[PDB]
């Protein structure tokens, strides 16, 4: 049930005590908490009491990633989400990409969130039906789409197909709740994301039944905003964000 291989060198979470503020960060599919760091110091060196986990399956190798399940997956975000509330009296959560799908997840079943930050979330994802249909146990991955290409991002070289079913079952659950989220949301969408759809988080934003919500739109980043040029706008925003909702 556990995994068979060592945590990656980049791969570890991240925690960090600070003040009675949280903030969980949820980092995407194949990817690890590397996606997600440069936020989680920003927020901790700004007073939040931060967790970023690492995803059950991911930051060891795709074989492990191969014997999860999407439950999994939402274990470790309410794993983080538990930590967090034994730690914080208010609790913001955020993500990219999965990790944006299962922060919507999350606030799915938790009405005490106090807003959630999903960055190019993912509740539909066409291409992946498609992909089948018309195979191999492990697809070859695509590179990071990131417009800055001296960046390096940490993801698994191959993409296990039963994972993608697994994320397609995911998302389809995720897309069917989102009426329940009322939490205020700041949804960042980049324009060139050449991996989820744009048009995803305009589902979200007339998904939710929040009444505080807005769409951010990047306009200098790819799919991996977090680690691409917009990153510093992503931070100081959801900074923002939190303080106002606190």
């Not at 999903?118 to 992946?128: C, L, R, Y």
Request: proline letters at 7%.
């Amino acid at each position: 049930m556990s995994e068979q291989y060592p945590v990656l060198s980049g791969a570890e979470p991240f925690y960090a005590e600070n003040g009675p503020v949280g903030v969980l960060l949820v980092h995407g599919f194949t990817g690890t908490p590397h996606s997600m760091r440069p936020l989680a110091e920003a927020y901790a060196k700004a007073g939040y009491t931060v967790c970023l986990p690492r995803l059950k399956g991911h930051g060891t190798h795709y074989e492990d990633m191969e014997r999860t399940t999407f439950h999994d997956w939402v274990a470790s975000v309410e794993e983080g989400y538990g930590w967090l509330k034994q730690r914080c009296q208010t609790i913001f959560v955020t993500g990219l990409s999965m990790g944006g799908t299962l922060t919507l997840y999350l606030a799915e079943h938790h009405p005490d969130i106090c807003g959630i930050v999903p960055i190019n979330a993912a509740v539909d994802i066409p291409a992946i039906a498609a992909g089948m249909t018309g195979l191999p146990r492990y697809l070859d991955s695509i590179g990071s789409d990131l417009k800055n290409p001296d960046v390096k991002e940490l993801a698994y070289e191959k993409t296990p197909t039963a994972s993608l079913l697994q994320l397609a079952r995911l998302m389809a659950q995720t897309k069917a709740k989102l009426d329940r989220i009322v939490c205020p949301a700041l949804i960042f969408v980049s324009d060139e994301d050449h991996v989820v759809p744009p048009g995803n988080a305009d589902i979200i934003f007339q998904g939710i039944s929040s009444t505080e919500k807005e769409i951010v739109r990047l306009r200098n980043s790819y799919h991996v905003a977090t680690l691409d040029y917009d990153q510093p706008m992503i931070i100081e925003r959801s900074l923002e964000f939190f303080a106002k909702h606190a």
